[PDB]
Nucleic acid binder design. Structure first.
Lengths: 137, 58, 94, 79, 119, 47
RNA sequence: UCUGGUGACUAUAGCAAGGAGGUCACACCUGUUCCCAUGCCGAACACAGAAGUUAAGGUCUUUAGCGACGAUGGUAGCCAACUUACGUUCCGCUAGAGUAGAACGUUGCCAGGC
RNA sequence: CUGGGGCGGUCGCCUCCUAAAAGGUAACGGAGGCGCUCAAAGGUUCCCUAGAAUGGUUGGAAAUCAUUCAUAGAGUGUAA
RNA sequence: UUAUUGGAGGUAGAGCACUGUUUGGACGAGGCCGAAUUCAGACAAACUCCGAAUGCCAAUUAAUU
């Protein structure tokens, strides 16, 4: 249910998926977070599906942070018609994520409790993740 | 000193640019020899097609 | 508060660094007061074990070749994937 | 029955530099074609009605800087 | 508290805008004139090279004289006229710095016009 | 916006054609053009 | 020599502070008779004064708090190869932007009185 | 013309993106315009230079302002 | 075709100084709580304070052809 209030163009060009994450590779809000290791497109439906599965097992006992927001909308032609007729209507919103990019961030809860909550939200995401903690050395 | 360049690989399936440089060196067919003087102008040409010729002091 | 470095040779190719980073070495640089720009290399386990006493900021005794200078950690390029350091910056505290 | 409304486009106007730096040109030769003042005129260089830079004396072209963030093209009589 | 503005500052700006399509060049040198709140100075400068070859002021020892605060300009113009007459007294571009053409400058400008300075 | 033909008094040739707004200036336009044959800035008048 | 007048160089030449002036010259100030002015006000512009004043502009000092200028060392990308194919891999080439250290309170030309 | 034809929609000119740092470059690819206006919106000389928040029209929290910032944030007959 | 030198240009990257999008702090604006300036951190074919490698235009002497 996450989408921009308004956009200049309703038709993009599909964000490229190559190289490593540009920025946001360190946890700065919570103490633990989920770091991606593969490149894929994250839709809003999956983002809200993993957040609902995390708060449900947390029983409102901590703060959750989302470091990703669908900024690019993608179109899709329905009822598989003949090719060549122009672009289709907007279907949904996605967000490109490259290896080394933090997805979620939890705080104010047991270290072992955040390790189980993040594992439940990793089963609703189509990318290999890894549990990491705030680094300082 | 002197240099002895020899064409060990063929130019079939090679980019036009490389083909022109090989003809500028003086090489004709495969396994062709050519003796020239060592200098920065010749070095550059040999560095462009170093994976097609064999250079050896002489 | 001690560390032994090795003056690195000039003009290092990508392969060289890769091989140097493949073992237990990490390219570093030294510059500050009463000193010029010198490129050296230290050990990863020897650096992390000698950076837990002074912590983030702390005077250290680096053995740049055949001399001892008091420097600190100014900057350090870290790699999120496989948590390994790649570059360290030493600034003369003097 | 999907329709379209984006199949219109104007022709391309060959813009950009027409003479290289250090090349000999004759009076009246065009040196640059742009839409505005991308490059200001230097010595022996006039501006046309369509902001076209042309030479007035036969010599060599010279692209230099004018100010700190503005370029300029001039021509010298010296052969 | 409305603040005042410098008079030389604005003048300089205007002068720079008028010096965008006017400059001296040996044969046709520029006659720059500097008018202060006491005396007035004038000198023929060659922008092409960047060296002066003339000088005339109202604070000169052979010009200083209790006048009507406008007659000096006339003398100043006639003073440099003779100096410019010695060598290079043909076509010359008159520069009005950044002030108006009406006033003391006008008198100094016409002073050389009646002297023979073909300008 | 209609066409305008500045007539001459001596030339007798329409070598000067311009445009104008009838709703704006409904009066006859009178300018001083130059007839080569007469070689003198004469006062032309719109027909 | 000095301050001025007019130029050349990319703000290393800017802004901010904290200072000292100076009256050679500048400025400031006094008017509205005089040419000449406000879409009106002599604010500005202009002309006549120029008694007083450094208070302000201001010239010379001090400071890197801004701003601009930024060594090196690394790597992002990339050229050419090789490999398996290329969300690559490895070997050569050129090596960025961000950032550290640092440098910076400008140098020059010409005319005059001084 | 046409991812068979039909139906629909288009057919000339102008600006940008696609276009891979010269120029050029396709698709029933993605966005907008034009079929004029102006006797001053022309020529020449001369002179000028937004938004925030406090003596409150119970207040549209922007009357035509005082002077700070303007630092150009505007403005340009018209789309870019 | 190399070598040497000069130049034109805004792509890959990167960046948030403008335009738009966005997240947590932070915003007051009414006899009771809602239009915010900063702090930190993200995104862009029709964003740019920046900016390569290649290619392109040319000039000179050299060297091969």
């Amino acid at each position: 249910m996450l989408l921009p209030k308004r956009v200049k163009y309703r038709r993009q060009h599909r964000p490229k998926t190559t190289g490593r994450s540009k920025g946001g590779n360190y946890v700065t809000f919570g103490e633990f977070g989920l770091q991606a290791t593969t490149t894929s497109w994250i839709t809003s439906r999956q983002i809200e599906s993993a957040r609902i599965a995390m708060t449900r097992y947390m029983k409102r006992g901590g703060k959750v942070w989302i470091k990703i927001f669908p900024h690019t909308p993608y179109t899709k032609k329905p009822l598989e018609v003949r090719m060549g007729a122009g672009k289709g209507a907007v279907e949904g919103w996605i967000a490109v994520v490259k290896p080394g990019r933090i997805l979620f961030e939890v705080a104010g809860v047991s270290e072992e409790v955040a390790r189980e909550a993040l594992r439940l939200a990793s089963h609703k995401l189509p990318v290999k993740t890894k549990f990491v903690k705030r680094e300082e050395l | 000193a002197k240099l002895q360049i020899t064409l060990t690989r063929s130019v079939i399936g090679r980019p036009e640019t490389q083909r022109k440089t090989v003809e500028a060196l003086g090489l004709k067919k495969t396994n062709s020899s050519v003796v020239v003087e060592d200098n920065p102008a010749i070095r550059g040409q040999i560095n462009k097609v170093k994976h097609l010729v064999t250079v050896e002091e002489k | 508060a001690s560390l032994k470095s090795i003056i690195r040779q000039g003009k290092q190719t990508r392969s060289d660094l890769k091989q140097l980073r493949k073992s237990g070495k990490v390219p570093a640089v030294v510059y500050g007061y009463g000193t010029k720009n010198v490129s050296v290399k230290v050990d990863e386990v020897e650096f992390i074990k000698v950076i837990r006493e002074v912590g983030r900021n702390g005077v250290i005794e680096l053995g740049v070749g055949s001399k001892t200078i008091k420097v600190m950690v100014a900057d350090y390029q870290f790699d999120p994937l496989k948590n390994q350091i790649t570059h360290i910056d030493f600034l003369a505290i003097n | 029955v999907s329709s379209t409304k984006n199949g219109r486009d104007s022709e391309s106007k060959r813009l950009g530099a027409k003479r290289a730096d250090g090349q000999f040109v004759t009076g009246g030769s065009i040196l640059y074609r742009q839409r505005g003042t991308k490059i200001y005129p230097g010595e022996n260089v006039g501006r046309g009605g369509d902001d076209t830079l042309f030479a007035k004396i036969d010599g060599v072209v010279k692209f230099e800087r004018k100010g700190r963030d503005k370029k300029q093209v001039s021509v010298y009589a010296v052969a | 508290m409305i603040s005042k503005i410098d008079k030389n500052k604005v003048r300089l700006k205007r002068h720079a805008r008028v010096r965008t399509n006017l400059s001296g060049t040996a044969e046709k040198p520029r006659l720059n004139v500097y008018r202060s709140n006491k005396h007035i100075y004038a000198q023929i400068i060659d922008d092409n090279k960047g060296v002066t070859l003339a000088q005339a002021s109202s604070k000169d020892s052979d010009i200083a004289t209790t006048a009507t605060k406008v007659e000096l300009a006339t003398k100043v113009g006639e003073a440099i006229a003779k100096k410019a007459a010695d060598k290079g007294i043909k076509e010359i571009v008159f520069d009005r710095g950044g002030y108006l053409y009406h006033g003391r400058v006008k008198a100094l400008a016409e002073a050389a016009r009646e002297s023979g300075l073909e300008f | 916006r209609v066409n305008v033909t500045l007539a001459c008094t001596e030339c007798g040739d329409r070598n000067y054609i311009t445009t104008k707004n009838k709703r704006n200036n409904p009066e006859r336009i009178e300018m001083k053009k130059y007839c080569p044959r007469l070689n003198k800035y004469t006062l032309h008048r719109e027909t």
